Design a protein around this ligand. Structure first.
Ligand SMILES: [Mn+2]
Ligand SMILES: [Mn+2]
Ligand SMILES: [Mn+2]
Ligand SMILES: [Mn+2]
Lengths: 423, 423, 423, 423
């Protein structure tokens, strides 16, 4: 009976040092029933998961920046960062399948993040294909990507579906938050509304079930928005009543005492279900992170923690230049093994085009010459995109075109280009 | 007869200073027969063509940069550039509906170009919604976009469809080139192939017909890659026979004598069927542009020209600081009223992120600080995206939410945000 | 300061027979503040809106079927139906931008509906382009489409965005229903959850404010699932308190007294905020729809109703042939001016393909030739797709190529075709 | 090296009974150089191509229908067809990412075809998912898909790129035709233009290289339109000169003597670089088919052929009902192991909706109840889609939902649904 052999193999897989901490309130029987008859392979997802787990257990910490194009993810890997962050904020702003500029209010189409992850993996694969074609070895391009699944884009089935989509697109890891989908909001926005703790756990179980049904040890990050969230949908859950002042808004939200206490309560509740815990934060406060991490290690020794080094903070207002300089080392040492500047891509794209565009209006081609000279200078450090035809794969596609002809083509592109003759 | 007015009203619109020197080898009765029973209204396109036309005549010249995201487009407009360039090179590298990193060899889906125009206009539309709600109006958001139609992605029927798609999306001008569509290549790549003059003209006719059928006076830009391309597909056209050496390649291609000679032949053929002539060039050489300008102006005095200040040139290697600085004034004088840096969008993005990522790898939040610190300094020039919640409409959608609510609303986004607290 | 002229124009358009007894809890100045500098024209939306309203005021009733491709819509208009239904259920199952087969649980991307409207309006537009070129005009092609906006896919902001999307696509009417977005099911599935009355009203205001913002009088259709829904998110609304039992579920949902009385409570609550009321129903019961009409008209005389002649009912099981044959004429007398078979596309498509497939396995082209004959015979009833090159516009694009070629062209498609030879 | 060992794995995988008599004008080392550093698994494409090969070699022949929705493909598999045809034509008319209705004139976005293969595999994945959850085995859902790549949509790299696209979407075979890509049109349209035989060969080689790089034995079908095509781009190939009259068109096309001898010249040139050969024909003439099967097998013994049972033929005009009944049986014994009704999807869809729309326009719900009854009748033969909630996976998701809850759930959809009361 290969039914009983398959369920056997599911079970053995579940019972390894990965998953040591974690609870699955479903049998292997259940996963078997719901995964169909043919097990599809998700190479980039599996590789990304295994590589992210190992980095997280073998590095001081993993520091990322959000990317909203493949070209950005590419230059992040070229610089030597070992993981890539997929910001829903950045997706709303400038990269969704509605083609709109959106504030972080869950207004964009739900397949936007997965498609971007798929685009980022595609850029990374072309980089690798190009490097491989030149017999280079100096970069491992399949950087784990950690993706924003917001509040699930609805109910647990919506969670289940987006988890599967992120895996198909090949994400190493996926974060889910405890906000009301109908009213999801940026973590550094007012008006945040919590769901019942049991609600947030159902969401996390749907993540893991999805991941199991795809047969990938995708990393589940449980985020909580409870440190600032002074609104709750329902007082039904015994764990949430203690935080309810017993008053109610004209929409019938329950008012709650937000602060590290409600953040810790949610963190503790979610941690048997999550590979990593994320506590949204009003400011960069190394002390608040020490107390949050202390609280969580108190009952969950060595549980991975992630920290948002948000551009949503005015860093040099909240902190002296020495503390900033040490911030990621300090967060490192408390257990925050994954740290990510969420809106790095937006700020990098918007500021960089503003400075070029404004100098261009003023000084025309002087502005562009200066950028091209900055790009040449940066070649000493790894940068190469100044040679933009090679950068995007004109080299690679020329070699394809030559294998297809047999050496006899008058239409080789990189040969006789301004790139080969002026750089 | 209501039909007779419609056929009269088309004709009247053709017989205006807008179409002063340009030939339509088809009749008002034709446009009528092909345009359906209902006149659909393309506001963004009409506005853009009318303003692109008025600007190219009023202003000394109009310099633009390539946008590949809505955000790049909008920061170009905020920095006071009066028009946006849509590079297909850029669509191919990092912004196409296949989600692939591609060289400039028409590998991406043909609807990628227009989807991006819509996306950009969606962003300028949200910027305009924002400024309007705030009673500001110190900026004109609806900058006209000039878009890459490459070589029409195939036959004249393809040219027809991609022009309509671009007008639907709100392009002000579209540019077609005279490369073989199966073998289309960056203009600065080797191994480019010409179609005959009559085929190149069929494409520009199909493009005006598209525009006449939609009822919009869209600027038509005709590009010649003949300045460098030494391959041609047919010896069929009288005007081209003079350039064929007599050699033929193993593929079939007729070899031709490239040079300013061929470009002038092509430009002069195209000039009566286009609004603006763009001679692709292999170095940023002003005498070459002067020679070309006077050649067209000899026959077509006051005909509009376009110069691609290509990042595919190495400006300091090829020019002294004085020329670079004066380059665009020079071109404007010669009659080049639209000057564009095609790959600006690409190099801003890649350079900016390689530089943030690299500094961030060594120095953690100290690097991100310097970007935030620079973003604040940039406000002296009119940069605002440092306050990123407001930049992308958080404030606009609050107003909408409060109007929907009466005013009784607890889930407002911007009030209570770290953005109001710390900025 | 032409502000005051523009605000006056907004106000006047609101005091017309259209929008008689239609409540807007907002001012013309609010609309002015949100709509932006510039007023983009939505020709199909305007036409469709204006036409659908006239049709509901001059016809015994409009009876329509569900469409999930252009071709389907196209043949519905060819058959003489005057309007088109866009089913979210059908989007779910076989026409969504995730390209997944889903049950009706809002598991698909929220832009799938508006995309499908654009595609239909495209097919219809080409049908029109063809007929116009051939000089025919026995069909008016611009049958208004009524589109499913489910429960807004989230909050009032989610509603406002999806309305505007539908208006860009060219919908005449959009329905919203009073289920929770995260728990949205098919109205004939079990375990539906209502939101509070004040919540549904906010969604219907967001809808209108979207329409006002876009200068288009789009039909708004408030749906209620309160006839069958035994759950509710919150007892906050004074108006809902009567229906609550006081039991709450293990998830916190308040049990309520599902039935025509709740359906009626919601209908009367929504009626002043929508042009059309639709009471979902669990069997085709004329007496039921009589009660419901009497109740609404009791307090809102004239109010247009809409009825789902759902395929989710077994029509033979529930009704004799006499009533089935009378059903739509009876509803029309009651004020159900828009009646629609939601899953007509689904059953037509799956049945037809299964039957062809089943026969083709056993009998090969013997089976296909029966269909091919069935199709010729259908020419008695007005079918023409049997000649499938002319059906999709081979002739029309041939007319375009000729105009382009100046009559020339040795590549015409329909000259030489097996269609001219064999049909 | 591990390099030499990977190069070998490639070399060994070619040196097998598949690839039989198949020339690659490149080395395993070439595939290694271009394939990047990781090799991604492609389960559906590998299963599809292994199964297709196996069917084509063990069944008397495979007969398949066109499909333009997953639902159409679903039902094709359920009625018991062993394979699915993806038709570029159908994609043009009612299934393209332009959302346009198009004639078969290569006017749609190239990734349309691959996007539709994804959707269909998804549909079959959810059917399989359902049948597993109900513990059924009677149907094998993973029916191989044969998809249209037209003329590669451009140069050989466009062929490279769409072949990959088709593989990562899970296509089992892809077909390529020797018409000029910019003038590409229906096999049964006039005005077809041939590319040189050397160029047809590059496109096939491009196809094999893509499949080899993704490491999947995708079935390549070479198609020729040289039976009817009387135009050619270049008289350059020495195999093509014989058929040149020496006349030229104004466009510069070479007139050629079209017919079975030209199609046999193309078939014999292409045979060594394809697994299966396809001669496009103007009528369902069994003699023509024997003369082709013969010409080809004379030099390429046991070469698989494909036949288009085209709906572009008026079947009962050209043949007696005796010959029609026996048509696929005969073609089979001649060696035509793949036989497909290209446009079955279009005809099934347009017929069934026109018929219902017309009946519904006259007799209202009497018309719909006749279809539903016709649907119930069909259950005798395996149809089940009349219970439409179970068909699209409401049951499957109810089980997912119940495993996430652990049995404490009041929002189960089939529980209390009209489907479970009336069916
Ligand atoms: Mn987020
Ligand atoms: Mn280009
Ligand atoms: Mn629905
Ligand atoms: Mn085809």
């Amino acid at each position: 009976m290969d039914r009983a052999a398959q369920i056997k193999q599911i079970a053995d897989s579940w019972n390894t040092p990965r998953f040591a901490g974690i609870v699955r309130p479903y049998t292997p029987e259940d996963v078997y029933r719901l995964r169909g008859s043919v097990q599809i392979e998700y190479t980039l997802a599996r590789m990304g998961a295994e590589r992210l787990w190992n980095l997280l257990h073998t590095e001081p910490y993993i520091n990322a920046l959000g990317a909203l194009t493949g070209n950005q993810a590419m230059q992040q890997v070229k610089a030597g960062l070992k993981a890539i962050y997929l910001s829903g904020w950045q997706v709303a702003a400038d990269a969704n399948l509605a083609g709109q500029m959106y504030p972080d209010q869950s207004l964009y189409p739900a397949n936007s993040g997965p498609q971007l992850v798929r685009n980022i993996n595609n850029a990374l694969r072309r980089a690798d294909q190009i490097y491989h074609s030149e017999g280079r070895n100096d970069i491992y391009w399949f950087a784990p990507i950690v993706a924003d699944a917001e509040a699930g884009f609805g109910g647990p089935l919506n969670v289940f579906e987006i988890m599967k989509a992120y895996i198909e697109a090949g994400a190493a890891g996926v974060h889910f938050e405890d906000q009301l989908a109908s009213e999801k909001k940026c973590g550094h926005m007012g008006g945040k509304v919590l769901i019942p703790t049991q609600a947030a756990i159902r969401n996390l179980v749907a993540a893991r079930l999805a991941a199991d049904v795809m047969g990938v040890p995708t990393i589940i990050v449980a985020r909580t928005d409870a440190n600032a969230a002074t609104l709750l949908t329902s007082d039904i859950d015994e764990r949430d009543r203690p935080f309810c002042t017993g008053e109610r808004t004209s929409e019938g939200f329950y008012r709650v005492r937000a602060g590290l206490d409600q953040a810790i309560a949610r963190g503790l509740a979610y941690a048997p279900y999550a590979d990593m815990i994320w506590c949204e934060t009003s400011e960069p406060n190394l002390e608040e992170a020490r107390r949050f991490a202390e609280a969580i290690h108190a009952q969950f020794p060595g549980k991975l923690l992630a920290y948002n080094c948000s551009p949503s903070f005015n860093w040099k207002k909240k902190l002296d230049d020495a503390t900033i300089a040490a911030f990621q080392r300090e967060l490192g040492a408390m257990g925050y093994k994954f740290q990510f500047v969420t809106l790095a891509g937006f700020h990098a794209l918007n500021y960089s085009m503003f400075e070029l565009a404004r100098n261009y209006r003023d000084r025309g081609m002087a502005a562009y010459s200066e950028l091209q000279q900055a790009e040449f200078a940066a070649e000493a450090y790894g940068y190469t995109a100044t040679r933009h035809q090679r950068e995007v794969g004109t080299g690679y596609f020329d070699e394809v075109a030559q294998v297809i002809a047999g050496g006899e083509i008058s239409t080789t592109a990189l040969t006789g280009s301004t790139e080969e003759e002026q750089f």
